[PDB]
């Protein structure tokens, strides 16, 4: 339906009504501070500090390694005109350029399957096999397409807590390209 009537309030009582409801997530925070970042949970379900058992973030310190490369301000604007969903060609050229400069298997998380299709079109498949998530496809088929031959996997949407891990279990994509932050459309 929607949360237009604050339907959330309802489910909040539900968590109260049980003995104890444990809401966890890898992304249950906006900031690294519990009480500043979980306030969207404190404000959407209606559960408040008094009734909140705990508000905490547990992050490991030594878990994995990570090199970050980010596009700066000067980088070409992603959308020449966002309303009618046109992607500026300069940004497409830059994105394909950086995609082709990768020397190993990579996971490209675009935001829309439309972005998946435009990026696949603009790519010349100069790199090892490019695997594309068709609009409304199933990710796991491309996952098992990718385990047999690791390469470049452009899969918008997807994720939902999934990972293209190998058979025994190993990081088979040293690079992960988030082309654009998946900014949600404006919803009048």
């Amino acid at each position: 339906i929607a949360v237009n009537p604050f339907i959330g309030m309802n489910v909040g009582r539900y968590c109260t009504q049980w003995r104890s409801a444990l809401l966890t997530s890898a992304t249950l925070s906006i900031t690294s501070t519990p009480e500043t970042g979980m306030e969207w949970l404190c404000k959407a379900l209606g559960l408040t500090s008094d009734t909140i058992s705990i508000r905490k973030i547990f992050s490991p310190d030594v878990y994995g390694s990570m090199k970050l490369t980010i596009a700066g301000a000067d980088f070409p604007k992603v959308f020449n005109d966002p309303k009618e969903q046109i992607f500026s060609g300069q940004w497409l050229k830059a994105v394909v350029e950086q995609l082709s400069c990768i020397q190993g298997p990579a996971l490209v998380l675009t935001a829309s399957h439309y972005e998946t299709r435009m990026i696949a079109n603009q790519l010349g498949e100069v790199s090892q096999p490019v695997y594309i998530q068709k609009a409304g496809q199933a990710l796991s088929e491309i996952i098992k397409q990718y385990q047999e031959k690791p390469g470049i996997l452009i899969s918008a949407g997807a994720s939902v807590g999934v990972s293209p891990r190998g058979e025994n279990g190993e990081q088979i994509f040293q690079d992960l390209i988030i082309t654009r932050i998946p900014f949600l459309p404006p919803d009048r």
Binding site: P76, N80, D81, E84, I86, F87, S88, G89, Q90, L92
Partner: protein, 342 residues
């Protein structure tokens, strides 16, 4: 000097259309939308105001009367002042301190200009927008296609000499080859109209220059057509108009209306009721209306208005109710002291 509110409904006996330049676009004739793109269209109060202003101008022209040949004593500048509020002679100063009390005189001598103001003089009449009551009371009308007369009807060929039939032959071949050429350059022009969309600003303007030179190429290809500069067979783009029987709420006001000015307004409404045409598309008989207005007055400080009467305009006649509207009309008709040479 009382305020009169004509609150009422316009029912469209024929579709009611207008093409206002800002509202219309590359798509085609479209009514102004009352807001955003998808908002309910309205008939402009500007068009209604212009129609009623010209009706009042003709009322005044008849009231002063014509000479034997039928010309009016008013000068061209007087006509333009009366029905458009423009001084062609350019003697209308905006905020000159010597017109501060030019108002009451110019009003009582020129009830028309007082009603419909000028550049510097506030119009006493405010003619509002006609807003439809229901939804889906508009639609695309006038959809058609001009077709060659001699292809639809074969008899007209026997009305043409041999050389004229050969001219029709040349004109048809000319339309055919010139149109396929125009179509080829058109599909190229819209191919790169689709191509500019994902273009940086420099290449954006470069593709817009390419579009304008393919437009000049369109024009040049048209020029080369010696038989006709334009095609003769073509689909006519439809125009957006209010449906027949659409009910449009209308609100007109005469602020501080004296008897003579209100009477002139009612005479204008009657003369418009002689030809109740609003908007344009005179072909297809678009614009014919049957409008009824409830005239209400509101003495300042009173908590309620008083309904002076009703003005029903129907194809079968004009009905005026209430003694007050009749009194205003008679007062205007019996006031001989109007000097419209303002």
């Amino acid at each position: 000097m009382r305020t009169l509110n004509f609150n009422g409904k316009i029912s469209t006996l024929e579709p009611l259309t207008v093409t206002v330049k800002n509202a219309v676009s590359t798509s085609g004739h479209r009514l102004p939308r009352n807001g955003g793109f998808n908002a309910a269209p309205y008939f402009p109060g500007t068009s209604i105001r212009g129609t009623l202003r010209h009706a009042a101008h003709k009322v005044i022209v008849d009231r002063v009367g014509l000479n034997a040949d039928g010309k009016s004593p008013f000068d061209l500048a007087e006509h333009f002042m009366l029905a458009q509020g423009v001084d062609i002679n350019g003697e209308a100063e905006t905020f000159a301190p010597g017109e501060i009390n030019a108002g009451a005189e110019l009003r009582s001598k020129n009830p028309l200009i007082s009603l419909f103001g000028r550049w510097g003089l506030s119009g006493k009449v405010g003619i509002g927008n006609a807003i439809p009551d229901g939804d889906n009371q508009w639609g695309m009308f006038g959809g058609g296609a001009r077709s060659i007369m001699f292809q639809r009807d074969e008899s007209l060929m026997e009305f043409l000499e041999t050389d004229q039939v050969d001219r029709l032959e040349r004109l048809l071949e000319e339309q055919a080859e010139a149109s396929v050429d125009i179509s080829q350059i058109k599909t190229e022009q819209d191919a790169l109209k689709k191509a500019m969309k994902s273009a940086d600003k420099d290449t954006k303007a470069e593709l817009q220059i390419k579009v304008r030179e393919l437009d000049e190429k369109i024009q040049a290809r048209k020029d080369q057509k010696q038989e006709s500069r334009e095609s003769i067979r073509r689909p006519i783009d439809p125009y957006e108009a209010f449906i027949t029987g659409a009910e449009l709420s209308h609100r007109m006001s005469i602020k501080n209306a004296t008897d003579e000015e209100a009477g002139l307004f009612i005479s204008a409404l009657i003369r418009f009721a002689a030809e109740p045409r609003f908007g344009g598309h005179a072909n297809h008989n678009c614009g014919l209306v049957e409008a009824h207005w409830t005239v209400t007055t509101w003495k300042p400080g009173e908590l309620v208005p008083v309904t002076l009467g009703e003005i029903v305009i129907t194809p079968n006649g004009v009905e005026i109710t209430g003694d007050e509207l009749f009194a205003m009309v008679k007062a205007f008709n019996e006031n001989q002291s109007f000097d419209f040479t303002a």
